[PDB]
Structure 1
Amino acid sequence: GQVANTRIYAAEKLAKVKEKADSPLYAPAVKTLLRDADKALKMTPPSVMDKTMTADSGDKHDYMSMGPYWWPDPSKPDGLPYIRKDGQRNPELDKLDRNKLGDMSKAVTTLGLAYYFSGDEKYAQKAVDFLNVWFLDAKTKMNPHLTYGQTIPGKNKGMGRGAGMIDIYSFTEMIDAMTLMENSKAFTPKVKKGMKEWFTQLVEWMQTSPVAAEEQRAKNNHGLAYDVQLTAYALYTGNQDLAMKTIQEFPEKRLFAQIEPDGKQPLELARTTALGYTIFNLGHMLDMCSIASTLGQDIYNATSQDGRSITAALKFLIPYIGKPQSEWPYQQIKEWDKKQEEACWILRRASFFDPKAGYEAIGAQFRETPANKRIHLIYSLE
């Protein structure tokens, strides 16, 4: 009858889905989750040691990634400096740490959820192997900083930039997966202490680094995402005062700054994937609403004097959901169907906070997500 202390996942909902794992509603998704976890068992845990290049610190244990939208310039003899092509991801980024970090993060989340749903230690043990290799083992560990996040060839004098902070956004969810495994045997006090210390050092770095300062001051989805991460990592590390403060400042610093009275997010709508970025930012807003609700803080209903809110932002998007791209007057260069589907899940999540608005009935009209998809477990109607 225990509810886990999750901050992004809706905890009471998730406890009820677990209790009803074998019911007809959830059994197909649980089956698929355990198949995914079984594939993860076969994976070899990667590390920041796997990249062929080294950051300009000379320390291979420093995380290094490349700005995904930055490409060689064909008008220059050696392609340098790189130039930006918004929305087009340069596959060279695969040489560096970003995708390995993603595989790890996704594997631990999969494994923690599989453990929660099954109680099978093999899932928790493999998760702990991933975490040891990535975070804790002297041989392979990532240092708790992103000084060299999103380097760009030929630019920024070999240094990272604040934008690289977005690379670890999935840690917000990974922390909830680790909480779900806390009572496993593999997830020991030593491992829990190790992880809390790594996140403690990361937060100290976020609070003092000039590189992290760049992300904190970002005006768009990067800034909003920074606060969500700072909050989640502060809570994980026991720093409730920093969490409370970041939450309390979030409507003025982020929501009211980035959302217009008519719901437009102009900095996202200017992008080549304007629908995708509008949804990216909304999903992170809803992540903050969820964290905040655990501390009794009502971010979802925070409303400016001139009418700016998450409700306004949703109201702007809704008329485009389920409609052809001909009806959308901004760019969306790719992933049209994928982002329409994600919009239906934004509606599911918003319905948790404003049931009366009828968001779920709007999304149910168009949503085609197969019954065995994990998302049904995580944003259920419990």
Structure 2
Amino acid sequence: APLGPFNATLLEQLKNDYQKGEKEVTRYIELQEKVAEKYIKMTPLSVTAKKKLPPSKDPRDYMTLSPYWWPDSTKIDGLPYIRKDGERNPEVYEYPERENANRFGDAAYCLGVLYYITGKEVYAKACANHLRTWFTDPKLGMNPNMTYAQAVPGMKKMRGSGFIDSRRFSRALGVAKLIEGSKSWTPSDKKKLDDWATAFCYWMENSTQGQRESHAANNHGLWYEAIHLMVLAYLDRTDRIREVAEQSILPKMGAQIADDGSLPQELKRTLSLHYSTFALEALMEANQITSQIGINLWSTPASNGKVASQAVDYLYPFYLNPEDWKFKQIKPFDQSRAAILLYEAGTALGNQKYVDTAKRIGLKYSTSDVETIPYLVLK
């Protein structure tokens, strides 16, 4: 399997069994094919489909609103916005990119994985239509930056926090690897997308905002490195992946896991069980890439001896019973998020207890959630 942001073992297993005609996998891939048919018809989305322009006046600049920032009723014009941690301001849906990056990301990811598994050219053709439009088109493609992501009206300083939005379309960037060699993904297509990814990676590493985000003390820093790895793996820069793993991910993990295994930076949030899980989800997705080159982020210690397994240990009780959670969680926690997390951390740590609970929680056999495509083992 090519290097990319997915469990390559589960993907290889599925393609292997599908080609062998194995009855149970074959009908499962056929259901996925039935779910994926809406993505073949779907019109490609573009970041430029917005009316309100960002300060650059360029519709190709991605812009969303930072979700927890609200107008201040006690100001005639509402400015400057104020923060209510954990309460999503519905003004976020006035920026079409917020949901459209998700819609595009799901479509490209699902089609690419189906093309890899089945070899059917119809999936590469449709995946490529989405990739070209979203990334490389000279009129419709998004500029390779996240300058105006999670802007806050009337905030004086530029922030890097919006970079975390990138995870929606960066999974799709990596899945582009899977359609290389099809008839639809031409060398010219690959060149343009390589150049875009090179430019986006330059922006991540050298813009002031990217630099700040790479030093974030909480899950923003972890998700920054998960996204970085997706870009680097798409550009086939495996040596950089190791260096990021050992000079950034491991030190960050070693600083953010407390001695007891809790994540103090996520504990202080209004959705602290969501953000403990979200922080580990960054690690899980980073690990799917590092482990394809022999680096197990779950078991590899930081310089101070801390290991990511300790953070799963701390949380595992509360995944069995989320109502036992003793920290602030102003909205109910979705236990289904732990299924994939516990499976991924479970197999990587040879911990059957985690894997057992992962299948008992399970995923819906017929769910259309694209991130669950590889996890038949959970259905």
Distance in 2, matches of 1:36 and 1:75, equals 48
Partner of residue 5 from structure 1, selected from 2, 5, 25: 2
Please tell me whether residue 322 in structure 1 is matched to residue 320 in structure 2.
Answer: yes
- CA shift, 1:222, in A, is 0.4
Which is worse superposed, 21-30 or 61-70?
21-30
User: Residue 112 of structure 1 corresponds to which residue in structure 2?
Assistant: 112
Per-residue Cα deviation, 1:160-201 (whole angstroms, up to 9, x for no partner): x21111111134432342222223211111111111110000
Distance in 2, matches of 1:153 and 1:95, equals 14
User: Residue 309 of structure 1 corresponds to which residue in structure 2?
Assistant: 307
- CA shift, 1:72, in A, is 1.4
User: Residue 180 of structure 2 corresponds to which residue in structure 1?
Assistant: 182
User: Residue 153 of structure 2 corresponds to which residue in structure 1?
Assistant: 153
* CA distance 1:16–1:76, shift in 2 (3 Å): same
Q: Structure 1 counterpart of 2:165, which letter?
A: D
Preserved CA contact (<8 Å) 2:238 2:293 = no
- CA shift, 1:299, in A, is 2.5
User: Residue 340 of structure 2 corresponds to which residue in structure 1?
Assistant: 345
- CA shift, 1:28, in A, is 5.2
* CA distance 1:269–1:27, shift in 2 (3 Å): farther
* CA distance 1:79–1:86, shift in 2 (3 Å): same
Distance in 2, matches of 1:246 and 1:324, equals 33
Partner of residue 363 from structure 2, selected from 359, 369, 376: 369
| Structure 2 gap segments, 5+ residues each | none
- CA shift, 1:36, in A, is 2.7
- CA shift, 1:50, in A, is 0.8
Preserved CA contact (<8 Å) 1:6 1:179 = yes
Preserved CA contact (<8 Å) 2:251 2:302 = no
Preserved CA contact (<8 Å) 1:17 1:377 = no
Per-residue Cα deviation, 1:112-142 (whole angstroms, up to 9, x for no partner): 1222233332222222111221122212121
User: Residue 121 of structure 2 corresponds to which residue in structure 1?
Assistant: 121
Preserved CA contact (<8 Å) 2:174 2:234 = no
Please tell me whether residue 195 in structure 1 is matched to residue 193 in structure 2.
Answer: yes
Written as runs of structure 1 = structure 2, the 5 A alignment for 1:22-61 is 23-27=22-26, 29-61=28-60
Partner of residue 214 from structure 1, selected from 212, 215, 227: 212
Distance in 2, matches of 1:135 and 1:43, equals 17
Distance in 1, matches of 2:181 and 2:303, equals 46
* CA distance 1:187–1:341, shift in 2 (3 Å): same
Distance in 2, matches of 1:350 and 1:188, equals 37
Secondary structure of 1:352's counterpart equals helix
User: Residue 332 of structure 1 corresponds to which residue in structure 2?
Assistant: 329
Percent pairwise identity:
34
Distance in 1, matches of 2:250 and 2:372, equals 33
Distance in 2, matches of 1:124 and 1:68, equals 34
Distance in 1, matches of 2:59 and 2:372, equals 39
Preserved CA contact (<8 Å) 1:261 1:306 = no
Per-residue Cα deviation, 1:201-257 (whole angstroms, up to 9, x for no partner): 011111210111121121000011112222221232243343221111135431111
- CA shift, 1:307, in A, is 4.8
Q: Structure 2 counterpart of 1:200, which letter?
A: T
User: Residue 276 of structure 2 corresponds to which residue in structure 1?
Assistant: 278
- CA shift, 1:306, in A, is 5.5
Q: Structure 1 counterpart of 2:264, which letter?
A: P
Q: Structure 2 counterpart of 1:212, which letter?
A: G
Q: Structure 2 counterpart of 1:346, which letter?
A: L
Preserved CA contact (<8 Å) 1:47 1:141 = yes
Preserved CA contact (<8 Å) 2:4 2:177 = no
Secondary structure of 1:14's counterpart equals helix
Please tell me whether residue 67 in structure 1 is matched to residue 62 in structure 2.
Answer: no
Distance in 1, matches of 2:138 and 2:249, equals 40
Please tell me whether residue 14 in structure 1 is matched to residue 8 in structure 2.
Answer: no
Distance in 2, matches of 1:6 and 1:192, equals 16
| TM-score when normalising by structure 2 | 0.91
Please tell me whether residue 378 in structure 1 is matched to residue 363 in structure 2.
Answer: no
* CA distance 1:23–1:370, shift in 2 (3 Å): farther
Distance in 2, matches of 1:202 and 1:98, equals 19
* CA distance 1:195–1:67, shift in 2 (3 Å): same
Per-residue Cα deviation, 1:11-47 (whole angstroms, up to 9, x for no partner): 2331221232364543454233222321112222121
Distance in 2, matches of 1:321 and 1:5, equals 33
Partner of residue 354 from structure 2, selected from 334, 348, 359: 359
* CA distance 1:26–1:330, shift in 2 (3 Å): farther
Q: Structure 2 counterpart of 1:98, which letter?
A: R
Preserved CA contact (<8 Å) 1:29 1:376 = no
Task: Please tell me the root mean square deviation across aligned C-alpha atoms, in Å.
Answer: 2.2
User: Residue 132 of structure 1 corresponds to which residue in structure 2?
Assistant: 132
Distance in 1, matches of 2:197 and 2:146, equals 12
Secondary structure of 2:348's counterpart equals coil
User: Residue 76 of structure 2 corresponds to which residue in structure 1?
Assistant: 77
| Structure 1 gap segments, 5+ residues each | none
Q: Structure 2 counterpart of 1:265, which letter?
A: L
* CA distance 1:144–1:120, shift in 2 (3 Å): same
